[PDB]
Design a protein around this ligand. Structure first.
Ligand code: MG
Ligand code: MG
Ligand code: MG
Ligand code: MG
Ligand code: MG
Ligand code: MG
Ligand code: MG
Ligand code: MG
Ligand code: MG
Ligand code: MG
Ligand code: MG
Ligand code: MG
Ligand code: MG
Ligand code: MG
Ligand code: MG
Ligand code: MG
Ligand code: MG
Ligand code: MG
Ligand code: MG
Ligand code: MG
Ligand code: MG
Ligand code: MG
Ligand code: MG
Ligand code: MG
Ligand code: MG
Ligand code: MG
Ligand code: MG
Ligand code: MG
Ligand code: MG
Ligand code: MG
Ligand code: MG
Ligand code: MG
Ligand code: MG
Ligand code: MG
Ligand code: MG
Ligand code: MG
Ligand code: MG
Ligand code: MG
Ligand code: MG
Ligand code: MG
Ligand code: MG
Ligand code: MG
Ligand code: MG
Ligand code: MG
Ligand code: MG
Ligand code: MG
Ligand code: MG
Ligand code: MG
Ligand code: MG
Ligand code: MG
Ligand code: MG
Ligand code: MG
Ligand code: MG
Ligand code: MG
Ligand code: MG
Ligand code: MG
Lengths: 115, 129, 179
RNA sequence: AGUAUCCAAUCUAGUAUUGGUAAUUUGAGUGAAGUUGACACAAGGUACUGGUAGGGGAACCUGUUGGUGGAAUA
RNA sequence: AGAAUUAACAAAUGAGUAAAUUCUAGGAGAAGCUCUGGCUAAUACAUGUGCCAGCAGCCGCGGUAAUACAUGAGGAGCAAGCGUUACCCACAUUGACUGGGUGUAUUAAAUACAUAGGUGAUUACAAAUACUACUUUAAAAGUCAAUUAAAAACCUAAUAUAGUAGUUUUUUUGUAAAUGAUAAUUAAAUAUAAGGAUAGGAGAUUUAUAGAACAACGAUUAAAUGUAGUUACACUAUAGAGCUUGCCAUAAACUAAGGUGCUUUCCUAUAUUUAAUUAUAGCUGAUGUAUGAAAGUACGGGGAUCGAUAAGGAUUAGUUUCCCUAGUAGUCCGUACUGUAAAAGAUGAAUACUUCAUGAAUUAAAUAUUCAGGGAUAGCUAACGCAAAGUAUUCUACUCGGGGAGUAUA
RNA sequence: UGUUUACAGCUUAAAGAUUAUUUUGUACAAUAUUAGGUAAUUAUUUCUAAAACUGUUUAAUAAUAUUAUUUUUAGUAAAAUAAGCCUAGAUGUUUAGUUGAAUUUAGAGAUUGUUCAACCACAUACGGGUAUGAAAACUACCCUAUCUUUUUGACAGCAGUGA
RNA sequence: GGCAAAAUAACCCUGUAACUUUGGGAGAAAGGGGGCUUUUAAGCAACUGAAAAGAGAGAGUAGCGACUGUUUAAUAAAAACAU
């Protein structure tokens, strides 16, 4: 197995292809593509068919950076990532709950102001 | 195999304590006598050894008469005696503390006998041919 | 069987692949009841039956039929769609569809009768055999692969081998041994 | 020059892992003309034996399933 | 053996030295070592010794008759070596590409699906490759069959890789307005002691109730222990329970194995045949997934039969035990673990072809063959034996003497 | 402010030879009584820093009005996004210098990796670090540490001695 | 007889063994931190900083009893009693 540099992001799996040696621009990439020998069909015709939270999101970020930085520092990138990806779902279902209250509070006025 | 760490490891060595070496020196603690198996019957002499590597051992005495006692430095051959058990090694004569077998003038190489002064008639050409 | 395992080996922790999209089973079950309530048996049409009486229709009606007969309609209902030529029965597009209708039954049979160990071994074969024809059909008629997986609620996961060994494998490259 | 950061040796502690040594204990092979008994090869005098469970001066005995590496019965 | 001279490595300078030349004497002036029973060429010679002393690479010698020990003679072989030890290679098909074996010779793991990987149908066509000849690279040293019959030397070949020419007598890869073994699907037909579930029947055994006022029954080579004396055993009737599923039964029944058999229905699975359809998707197969008799374990239920342990009876025996009475766990079902065996056809999976007799079965004017071991033989095999364990091809695994040992340790 | 075609020696630039360093593929021991390992880790983009600056025209690029754009190395003691990479015996343990090749062999192969030669490594220590130079640490130099005799020194340089 | 005394002392963070009835052991052990500045400083700090006061010493290994508990008011609170 090798990893190859495609500039146009043009190839898919079944496309059979010649590859050639290049000096390493990155680690584990010392090959690039020269030519497709046999194509494999694409998924373009099917791909064409396929907001208030932004105030929810930007708070939840600032919540944990204030907490985490005080409690536990940079030491390991694994901690830096395994937290965030695992903390947001814990945060979003609590931040969705912050906005679901908005639909509740506005109507409880109208119910009390009207009658 | 674990004592052996060269060549065909699948081969069981023919002298395990002595190992890869061809010979090894040791010191006697005590002499003994051992009987052979049932088809034969005799009293074959035996000579314990502690080796320089600190390993107990038994060994054979081919010569008829022998100088062996306690605290005697000896050299092992590795061959062995057949009828006896545990005597698959054998000592060498003509070395540090053994003695050439005596009243003997045949097979003068196994037992360490030098050549007598009668049979030899001429000297080596490095001096007075 | 096939699992998410990018290396040559196949571990315990590696998970099996997904048979259906989320909520794929229930959607298909709903489609059946719609058919079962408004259809007749496979060979017969409504047009042939309009002179005859209701007592003749209710017998031929598919409510009263057996599940072995409920499929035969669904299979021929698919063959008219996913065929290449007339009187087609064995092409790849149909062969996948047959196993999808069986999985609906084997699961019902296995969730209920859990001790039928011979059936538990039979699922593993259906999935594997489905997993082959499901791949061989990508390779040949890719624009029919997608027209199937939508209907039967199947995910579009390519093979990890990349169709390497069936397609145009040749001239495999030269290197030298030394020491 | 020098402040402050980074870093090595040595030392301390415990933990992890692998080896060396020991009071004491235990197993195996081997040798020989030993004692007790007679398990085994014949249907070995109650057919042997595998897997298993229990029992038990020893070799062994019994149940439960399997096999023939057992004879015998016309 | 002794003595002398020169060349050349510096046509100015040599440390040291010719596998060069000549001269004189004299006439091999250099021999040991192993062995003497067989393998192994060499003595039935002599003496003493007496399973002692001792030899011994392997087999094995020695018990008063020693070609095997020790003494002596004679005799054989190798030779500036001979012999011993230790390790490695060959001889060895003793580690199997060349080149094995795997039914019984301490060798196919219990079994099947399946991944990586390996492997593989027809024709036509292209392209490339193999094979042949030439050529590229692969340090020298070293090896190497150097050649005009020549020593002090400089084989250019092999193998591998890239590349050219010849395309004819090989193969691979792949594509076709393609054909179409195999595997699979559909429709029809037929078969299944294959698996699970629902419903229902049947059988004996056992308990209970009732009836009847008999006194013994049951076990055993025999006997006792034991049950009852107011019917217990036994017979008849009625009901209930747990377990099991008669004849059909057979080699020619099924399935991956374990293993499985009363009827009905649904689901699941396998197989055979024709027609149509798709057109190599197939065959194999570490890791891995899943199954896996019986005994046994936990919880719960059920609890008739058989029946470990322990008890008793006896006998023969001096013990223990095989026999007998009674009978606990268990034996059965559900949930889950456990994951072993002589797990067997002691034979890895698949394809093609192959004998004679005897015999089982469809049933054919749509369609023609399948099967068996209870016989023998070709061929193979150490032999007994097998119609595959045979002929041919494809993939995987195990196997480096035995004890220790399927044990220790982790 | 003698002559640099009188001889020697030195400086600077270019062209080329050679050398040093940097890059990849395959080959490369046993073991599962070791199976999860990696965490600036895997990929892109960006930022910073060093590389001589500015303009003119042309080409080319995407839209197209014609303006704008055009490169390489290093750093996570720079940051962001997305989540990947190795596991087709990663990692871990043990053993070991690799090779040409030597012994053997009909041939394939097996065992070894001594002499000489190539490459790599070490130079009391599996140690830390610098200056010069086209290239270094081998008898260089500084520090720590071990051992030893003189504040030196480490004979795996030749010869030699002990063990 | 280290009895008494001394020492440890709350809160936050890192980290945490054998054994185990898988609950626990465990607050295990071990170690660190608390200010001012202006800039986020590869900055400062001139005995003593939760500034004074207040709050656990920890580990290793045997014997009896399972545990919480109860008891001889006025010399015995334990291996005894209970459970
Ligand atoms: Mg001891
Ligand atoms: Mg006997
Ligand atoms: Mg017997
Ligand atoms: Mg006994
Ligand atoms: Mg027998
Ligand atoms: Mg000269
Ligand atoms: Mg002369
Ligand atoms: Mg002879
Ligand atoms: Mg005599
Ligand atoms: Mg060989
Ligand atoms: Mg088998
Ligand atoms: Mg198998
Ligand atoms: Mg495959
Ligand atoms: Mg060469
Ligand atoms: Mg009665
Ligand atoms: Mg079966
Ligand atoms: Mg059971
Ligand atoms: Mg129970
Ligand atoms: Mg059999
Ligand atoms: Mg069986
Ligand atoms: Mg077997
Ligand atoms: Mg053969
Ligand atoms: Mg054979
Ligand atoms: Mg036969
Ligand atoms: Mg047959
Ligand atoms: Mg065979
Ligand atoms: Mg063995
Ligand atoms: Mg054995
Ligand atoms: Mg066992
Ligand atoms: Mg074990
Ligand atoms: Mg231990
Ligand atoms: Mg060769
Ligand atoms: Mg070397
Ligand atoms: Mg040397
Ligand atoms: Mg040298
Ligand atoms: Mg030194
Ligand atoms: Mg050098
Ligand atoms: Mg020296
Ligand atoms: Mg105190
Ligand atoms: Mg105090
Ligand atoms: Mg805690
Ligand atoms: Mg805890
Ligand atoms: Mg603490
Ligand atoms: Mg504690
Ligand atoms: Mg502390
Ligand atoms: Mg305070
Ligand atoms: Mg406290
Ligand atoms: Mg307190
Ligand atoms: Mg104690
Ligand atoms: Mg007590
Ligand atoms: Mg208490
Ligand atoms: Mg208390
Ligand atoms: Mg009180
Ligand atoms: Mg009191
Ligand atoms: Mg008190
Ligand atoms: Mg008490």
């Amino acid at each position: 197995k090798y990893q190859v540099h495609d500039s146009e992001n043009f190839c898919v799996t079944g496309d059979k292809v010649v590859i050639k040696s290049m000096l390493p621009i990155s680690t584990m990439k010392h090959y690039y593509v020269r030519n497709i020998v046999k194509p494999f069909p694409r998924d373009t015709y099917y791909k064409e068919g396929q907001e208030q939270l932004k105030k929810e999101y930007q708070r939840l970020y600032q919540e944990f950076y204030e907490r985490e930085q005080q409690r536990t520092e940079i030491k390991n990138k694994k901690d830096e990532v395994t937290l965030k990806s695992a903390l947001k779902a814990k945060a979003l279902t609590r931040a969705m709950a912050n906005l679901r209250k908005v639909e509740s509070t506005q109507k409880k006025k109208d119910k009390v102001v009207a009658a | 195999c674990i004592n052996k760490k060269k060549g065909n490891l699948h081969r069981k060595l023919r002298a395990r304590i002595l190992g890869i070496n061809p010979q090894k020196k040791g010191v006697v603690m005590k002499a003994r006598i051992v009987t052979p198996r049932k088809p034969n019957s005799a009293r074959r002499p035996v000579a314990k050894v502690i080796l320089v590597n600190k390993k107990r051992l038994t060994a054979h005495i081919p010569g008829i008469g022998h100088n062996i006692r306690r605290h005697s430095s000896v050299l092992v051959r590795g061959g062995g005696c057949r009828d006896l058990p545990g005597v698959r090694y054998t000592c060498v004569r003509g070395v540090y503390d053994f003695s050439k077998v005596l009243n003997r003038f045949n097979r003068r190489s196994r037992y360490g006998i030098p050549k007598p002064d009668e049979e030899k008639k001429k000297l080596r050409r490095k001096f007075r041919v | 069987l096939m699992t998410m395992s990018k290396s040559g080996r196949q571990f315990a922790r590696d998970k099996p692949l997904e048979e259906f999209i989320p909520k794929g089973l229930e959607k298909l079950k709903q489609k059946e009841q719609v058919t079962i309530n408004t259809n007749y048996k496979a060979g017969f049409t409504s047009e042939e039956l309009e002179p005859y009486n209701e007592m003749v229709k209710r017998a031929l009606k598919l409510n009263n039929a057996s599940p072995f007969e409920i499929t035969q309609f669904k299979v021929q209902q698919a063959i008219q769609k996913f065929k290449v030529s007339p009187r087609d029965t064995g092409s790849a597009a149909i062969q996948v569809a047959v196993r999808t209708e069986k999985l609906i039954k084997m699961i019902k049979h296995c969730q209920e009768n859990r001790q039928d160990k011979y059936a538990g071994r039979a699922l593993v074969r259906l999935l594997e055999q489905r997993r082959k024809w499901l791949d061989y059909l990508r390779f040949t008629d890719y624009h029919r692969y997608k027209w199937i997986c939508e209907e039967f609620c199947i995910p579009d996961q390519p093979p990890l081998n990349g169709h390497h060994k069936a397609n145009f494998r040749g001239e495999p490259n030269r290197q030298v041994k030394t020491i």
